[PDB]
Design a protein around this nucleic acid. Structure first.
Length: 138
DNA sequence: CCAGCGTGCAGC
DNA sequence: GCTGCGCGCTGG
């Protein structure tokens, strides 16, 4: 499965090959603008390039990176616990993991697996992308 | 000036 | 179903 590139330019379109990075991006976009979250995301992935490095991370360090975005302590602690769970739990769908809910699970299901047809999103940009997929289908 | 909002989520 | 978290951003 290769989720196609769209005129919406969802960050998920580039991070689909690495479910962890794609799921971390979803966390970054939780009630936060793309224009704001995305540049911080690249600096985060520079410092914490894998779930292995992030599960070991000190949340206060992650918090300092997340400071301008808001939800800095909640998400720094959520990032660390999510990364640990991501590597320890024997999960099929990421909604089973701490910090991933309907939105991140719908992104995984559209982008990391070929299950978009079964997904019913409720996130603005993801809805636009998902509606566009059903339209430009065949 | 200052309220509303951003590709939510856990926990009660 | 409700509530806390939360900044920086934009607009009457």
């Amino acid at each position: 499965w290769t989720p196609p590139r769209s005129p919406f330019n969802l960050v998920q379109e580039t991070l689909f090959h690495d479910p962890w990075k794609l799921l971390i991006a979803t966390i970054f976009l939780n009630r936060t603008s793309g224009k704001m979250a995305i540049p911080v995301l690249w600096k985060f992935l520079e410092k914490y390039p894998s779930a292995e490095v992030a599960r070991t991370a000190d949340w206060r360090d992650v918090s300092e990176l997340l400071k301008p975005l808001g939800l800095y302590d909640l998400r720094a602690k959520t990032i660390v616990k999510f990364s640990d769970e991501y590597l320890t739990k024997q999960w099929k769908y990421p909604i089973e993991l701490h910090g991933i809910g309907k939105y991140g699970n719908d992104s995984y299901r559209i982008f990391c697996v070929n299950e978009w047809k079964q997904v019913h999103p409720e996130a603005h940009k993801l809805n636009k992308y998902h509606d566009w997929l059903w339209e430009n289908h065949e």
